[PDB]
A and B are shown apart, each in its own frame.
With several copies, the nearest count.
Chain A
């Protein structure tokens, strides 16, 4: 079942429907950007649509192909955004072509927007009735000088991933630096090529036996010292 309130479900029974409104939120905090709020249309005052107090500005956005299924391939709906004045290209050249971000689609009925969107003022406003979905941007299939097409995907979709992440190595580590297994917290001692530096900005392990010996954590080495198992 869905988290649909009783009031909106009851309203979604009558013949004389209201106007469906779709609003989009592009979240880039996890990738290094900001939160952008878009709406396909504006109110009667020629103003950004106000919902839950926040404002969605008008911009041509169109999402097509939302197909949830359990078999076959995954779902890859398409989002089209007008690229005029180079606005999309500006963030694309900066945010690595909008790869890894999140998109949230909220759909609302017209009779529940804030009262400031209507000259008479809606008395039926209720800023808690909407339907929410989230997806992740996969690629920018085409961004011309007039438009831009993004492919969407489910966050939990598996593609190109293998289950047994463990890999057996001979003289190379397998985990990160200082994360969980390299319980190192002392001063910087080494760098990429195992040089005796003492600066923290250049401290990165070489993923070798010599790096471990330098950092005195050879007891936590991921590379088994077999090597000569296939020669004999």
Chain B
């Protein structure tokens, strides 16, 4: 089904982006 998959993928992408922001701002990385 379209809309359910779209909303699920959007929320999962938001969670992934939040996790990436959290993990890259520790000591090194590119210091976002």
Contacts and interface: CB of A to CB of B under 8 A. Distances in A.
A94 interface: no
A160 B26 CA distance: 8
Interface string A133-175: 0000000000000000000000000111000000000000000
Nearest to B25: A73
Interface string B1-32: 00000000000000000000001101111100
A137 B6 CA distance: 26
Number of contact residues on A: which range applies? under 10
Contacts, number: 17
Interface centre among A72, A74, A159 (most CB of B within 10 A): A72
Contacts of A159: 26-28
Nearest to A71: B28
Contacts of A158: 27
A71 B30 CA distance: 10
A73 B19 CA distance: 14
A158 B28 CA distance: 9
Nearest to A160: B27
B17 to A, nearest CB: 14
Interface of A: 71-74, 158-160
Query: What 5 A-B pairs come out closest when comparing CB atoms?
Result: A73-B28, A73-B29, A159-B27, A72-B29, A74-B28
5 contacts: A72-B28, A72-B29, A73-B29, A74-B28, A160-B27
